[PDB]
Amino acid sequence: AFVVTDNCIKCKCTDCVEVCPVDCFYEGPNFLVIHPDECIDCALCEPECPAQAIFSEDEVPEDMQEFIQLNAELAEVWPNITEKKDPLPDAEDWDGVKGKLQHLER
Numbered sequence: 221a222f223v224v225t226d227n228c229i230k231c232k233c234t235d236c237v238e239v240c241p242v243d244c245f246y247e248g249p250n251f252l253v254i255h256p257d258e259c260i261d262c263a264l265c266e267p268e269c270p271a272q273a274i275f276s277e278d279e280v281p282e283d284m285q286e287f288i289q290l291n292a293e294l295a296e297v298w299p300n301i302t303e304k305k306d307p308l309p310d311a312e313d314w315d316g317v318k319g320k321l322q323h324l325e326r
């Protein structure tokens with residue numbers, strides 16, 4: 221499965237949803253997650269993230285391993301998103317900044 225990690229938080233560009241064939245992205249107030257049992261590992265979303273927050277599960281950075289289980293869990297409670305929308309208002313302010321996990325809204 222692929223994994224949305226820290227830099228999506230407070231950016232939420234949603235460009236990634238355009239290319240998923242199986243529609244497995246689920247939407248939070250200020251983050252997206254990939255449903256691990258639905259992702260077919262086509263790797264198509266990851267060139268599309270402007271914030272470069274998507275990784276193959278096995279390539280998720282050591283310091284961002286928490287995101288793997290987070291994606292699994294929130295994928296059960298969040299709504300499915302299928303169309304691209306506007307990025308969060310302050311997206312480019314928050315892009316490239318580290319430790320945005322602290323601001324995750326559920």
Ligand code: SF4
Nearest residue numbers: 240259260262263265
């Ligand atoms: S690897 Fe493919 S199936 Fe998975 S979330 Fe990405 S675009 Fe979708």
Ligand code: F3S
Nearest residue numbers: 228233234235236269
């Ligand atoms: S910022 Fe997030 S909404 Fe997608 S386009 Fe990137 S994983």
